[PDB]
Design an enzyme around this catalytic site. Sequence first.
Site, PDB file in Angstrom:
ATOM      1  CE  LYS A 225      24.622  19.194 -49.159  1.00  0.00           C
ATOM      2  NZ  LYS A 225      24.243  20.338 -50.044  1.00  0.00           N
ATOM      3  CG  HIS A 247      22.010  14.921 -49.678  1.00  0.00           C
ATOM      4  ND1 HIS A 247      20.643  14.825 -49.525  1.00  0.00           N
ATOM      5  CD2 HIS A 247      22.261  16.218 -49.980  1.00  0.00           C
ATOM      6  CE1 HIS A 247      20.092  16.004 -49.734  1.00  0.00           C
ATOM      7  NE2 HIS A 247      21.050  16.872 -50.011  1.00  0.00           N
ATOM      8  CD  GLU A 308      17.221  18.033 -51.283  1.00  0.00           C
ATOM      9  OE1 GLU A 308      17.365  17.617 -52.450  1.00  0.00           O
ATOM     10  OE2 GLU A 308      18.133  18.607 -50.648  1.00  0.00           O
TER      11      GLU A 308
END
Length: 481
Positions: A225, A247, A308
């Site tokens: 992430k 991410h 997201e």
Amino acid sequence: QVVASNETLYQVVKEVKPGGLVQIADGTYKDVQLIVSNSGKSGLPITIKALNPGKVFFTGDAKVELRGEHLILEGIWFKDGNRAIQAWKSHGPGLVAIYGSYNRITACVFDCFDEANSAYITTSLTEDGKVPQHCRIDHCSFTDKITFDQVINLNNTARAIKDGSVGGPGMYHRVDHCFFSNPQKPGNAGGGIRIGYYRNDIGRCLVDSNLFMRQDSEAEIITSKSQENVYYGNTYLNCQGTMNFRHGDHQVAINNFYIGNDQRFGYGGMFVWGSRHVIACNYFELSETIKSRGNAALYLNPGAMASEHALAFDMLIANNAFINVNGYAIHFNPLDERRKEYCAANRLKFETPHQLMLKGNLFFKDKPYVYPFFKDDYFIAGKNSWTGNVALGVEKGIPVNISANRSAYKPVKIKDIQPIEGIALDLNALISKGITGKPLSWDEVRPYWLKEMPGTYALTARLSADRAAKFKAVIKRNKEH
């Protein structure tokens, strides 16, 4: 000096100077609360190690905090734990929490420690916000973890609802030669490793030469992430999950081996969110793929750009090999129904994978599997570029002209890839050589003093009666009453 009790350990650590060496006498150190606040110096680290690795055990309601810098924790075996379940949480500090930079934890064993939820090792921010950097976790074994949260969390931000353009600073940590094999937990229960939290976070961490064997904790083997992390030369053997660029854009995965060699479970795999990635020279040979995710080796996330569930687009997929994958080699729109709904509910614009540069990839199949090489329900001519690939054994599944000439297959030369600052790897040279070496084995990663593999999950896919009982209890108290 040589210490033989928790109290003398505490005392010597409080007096130790740079270059110091603290050796723990053979024995069990129960409920040990090792807090190292002093600092070693560059070239003069403070080393805390077992006098005889394999004969020192940290047990009970224990905890280790490396707060100073230039410290080294070596040859410790963590087992028979008893931390309070109402005192620890996922997203909190790990059993071993590293709060200072330039620290190393090596040749340690973590084996089904206890029932308190938390990672086994974490790099954590101090209360004033400082972020640990340049740490290394190597030659450590992580087995039979029966608690929630990842095995290892590398943090550069505190958890928050989020999305203030702000992002966490680059960490420059390294995780290498570690062994991960842990039982499957329900839902998003924490996987193997997590680096960062949101897409604006910068990682620049190197994860290389690790062996994940039946790392089944959850859907995510590694949930990367943060930006610019490099995953090189890792082996993922029979893992019920996928290695993810969850991410953060511009991530790198080079020469990793994703192998599934039996029919016991569905294995993976890489699930990719975001753009500007470099996915090259990886080897995928999966006897069974994951049904819940779409049955593929490489999953390219459909969705809203920089969201997201960031759309996967504009990236390089080169010199990878997909050999006898029992599923699609590449799925161009996995979980699209859910992603569409997600975008609609958030007023986001749903899009599908495009601007993909697929160069010099090999797709081969000669086993009685039924999946064509690709799945793209939203195929559009020219949205992607295919060059120098080879495919044979089964239909492609999409209208793309690809050479079927295996004897002419050759990995492609890539030379425009910028290296990641802080990571000493020549990305252009590595990609250009094609796939090197082969899957890593236990002997290539194990702690120098450890001969046999701890735990039972890796070799049997089963937990002992005692450990299976504790695992059910952990899962049960974390579910609706």
